[PDB]
Amino acid sequence: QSALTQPPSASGSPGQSVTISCTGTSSDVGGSDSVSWYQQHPGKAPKLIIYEVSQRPSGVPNRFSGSKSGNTASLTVSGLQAEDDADYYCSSYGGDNNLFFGGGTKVTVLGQPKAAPSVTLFPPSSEELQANKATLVCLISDFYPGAVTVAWKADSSPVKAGVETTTPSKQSNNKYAASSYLSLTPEQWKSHRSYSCQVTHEGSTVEKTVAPTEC
Amino acid sequence: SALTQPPSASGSPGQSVTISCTGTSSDVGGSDSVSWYQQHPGKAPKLIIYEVSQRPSGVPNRFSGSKSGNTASLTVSGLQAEDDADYYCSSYGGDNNLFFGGGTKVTVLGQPKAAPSVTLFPPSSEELQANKATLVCLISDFYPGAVTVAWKADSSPVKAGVETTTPSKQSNNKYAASSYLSLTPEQWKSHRSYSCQVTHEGSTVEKTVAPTEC
Numbered sequence: 001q002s003a004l005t006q007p008p009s010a011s012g013s014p015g016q017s018v019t020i021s022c023t024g025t026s027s028d029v030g031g032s033d034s035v036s037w038y039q040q041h042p043g044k045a046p047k048l049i050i051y052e053v054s055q056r057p058s059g060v061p062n063r064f065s066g067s068k069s070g071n072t073a074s075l076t077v078s079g080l081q082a083e084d085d086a087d088y089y090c091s092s093y094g095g096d097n098n099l100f101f102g103g104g105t106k107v108t109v110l111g112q113p114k115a116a117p118s119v120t121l122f123p124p125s126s127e128e129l130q131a132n133k134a135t136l137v138c139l140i141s142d143f144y145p146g147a148v149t150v151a152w153k154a155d156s157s158p159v160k161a162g163v164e165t166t167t168p169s170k171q172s173n174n175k176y177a178a179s180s181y182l183s184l185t186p187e188q189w190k191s192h193r194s195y196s197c198q199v200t201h202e203g204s205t206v207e208k209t210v211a212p213t214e215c
Numbered sequence: 216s217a218l219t220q221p222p223s224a225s226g227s228p229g230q231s232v233t234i235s236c237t238g239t240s241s242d243v244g245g246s247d248s249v250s251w252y253q254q255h256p257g258k259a260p261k262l263i264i265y266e267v268s269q270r271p272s273g274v275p276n277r278f279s280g281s282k283s284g285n286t287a288s289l290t291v292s293g294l295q296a297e298d299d300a301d302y303y304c305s306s307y308g309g310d311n312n313l314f315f316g317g318g319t320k321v322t323v324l325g326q327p328k329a330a331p332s333v334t335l336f337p338p339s340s341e342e343l344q345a346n347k348a349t350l351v352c353l354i355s356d357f358y359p360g361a362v363t364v365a366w367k368a369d370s371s372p373v374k375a376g377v378e379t380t381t382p383s384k385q386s387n388n389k390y391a392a393s394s395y396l397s398l399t400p401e402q403w404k405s406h407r408s409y410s411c412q413v414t415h416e417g418s419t420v421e422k423t424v425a426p427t428e429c
């Protein structure tokens with residue numbers, strides 16, 4: 001029901017600026033001046049930092065600013081500071097007393113060099129197929145920041161069910177890793193041309209594809 | 216200033232739990248604009264109540280919201296494991312302000328033990344073509360969320376090259392993790408087999424895979 005799209009992540013080093021977007025439709029974002037932005041440090045209560053597109057509540061520094069053009073609102077955070085590292089969400093009203101939220105953007109203040117993920121996609125192992133399971137696994141390692149989005153395709157169609165992705169965890173080399181897995185039945189696996197795992201990190205996407213084989 | 220919520224609340228499966236949200240005459244007690252949100256750790260939240268008592272579409276009627284004076288309450292009946300989460304309240308006040316409480320972590324006590332499903336995968340053709348032979352041991356559907364992993368090369372302990380991720384809770388309310396062993400193709404092809412041994416609650420599950428015959 002929400003139409004609000006936010007990029008999954010953004011990053012900068014201390015003292016840089018970052019702008020993040022919140023795209024809706026004419027009936028929500030573009031239909032009034034009612035966009036809000038909220039900051040949440042993980043595991044703590046969120047806070048309203050912008051209301052009515054551009055207004056800061058008391059105590060929010062003027063490094064945070066909000067604007068809008070058409071059906072896209074934008075939050076800019078100049079002068080990045082360590083405390084800015086957080087998840088940011090938008091909202092907008094959208095007709096018939098409805099409030100709509102974006103999916104959130106994780107903003108990292110870079111604490112180490114950026115590292116793109118190594119992505120390995122594994123087809124079903126012989127043992128699990130003999131157990132009537134065709135789970136595929138997409139291994140994603142050695143990445144920084146530790147924010148990664150994963151999507152799967154059956155052929156070219158988005159896969160809407162049976163997907164799980166672990167929360168990225170910092171490994172012994174101090175880069176993050178995670179796994180996404182898609183719990184297919186053998187029929188599903190053998191009857192499609194292929195399945196693909198798409199990993200998005202720092203706004204660039206990598207795709208890996210596998211297909212059934214006989215042995 | 217925050218609204219006041221207890222930091223913790225708990226209940227057993229099927230039982231009920233009530234949590235409160237105490238504000239002031241100019242926020243919670245000033246109008247009917249109290250909302251509640253649910254949030255699983257590491258996930259986006261979900262609005263479960265608005266305007267004190269109203270459920271958005273898709274919210275079960277086991278969640279109920281009320282207010283008396285300056286204190287709003289949320290009651291979750293028929294507790295289920297998927298209800299184990301953090302719960303925040305909010306209430307618009309004057310001057311375009313929006314106040315939030317500090318969050319209550321609701322724990323659903325006594326969730327059942329569950330042993331891991333372990334699937335070991337051998338190196339993919341693509342990665343072998345790129346001169347890599349990482350193996351992955353997928354570990355899912357377990358509870359509670361602590362496992363240890365050891366790897367074997369033939370029968371011998373593997374002391375290097377192992378990473379295991381920190382278990383995270385998944386949509387079925389049980390944990391998952393992967394352990395991955397970064398072999399060279401030469402290490403992979405020179406052994407009879409590799410094994411992934413997963414220990415959970417004193418019990419071990421071992422899987423073994425060997426270089427393919429095709």
Ligand SMILES: Cc1cc(N2CC[C@](C)(c3ccccc3)C2)cc(=O)n1CCNC(=O)NC1CN(c2nccn3cncc23)C1
Pocket residue numbers: 001002003004005038040045046089100101102103104252254259260261262303
């Ligand atoms: C997501 C969400 C956020 C939140 N907050 C965040 C602000 C808040 C005040 C907060 C923050 C922290 C802790 C506590 C509270 C309220 C409430 C909420 O209820 N939620 C779910 C509903 N809304 C969305 O999840 N939108 C999503 C993307 N979105 C879509 N965007 C475009 C097209 N789409 C087609 N299908 C889906 C989408 C998926």
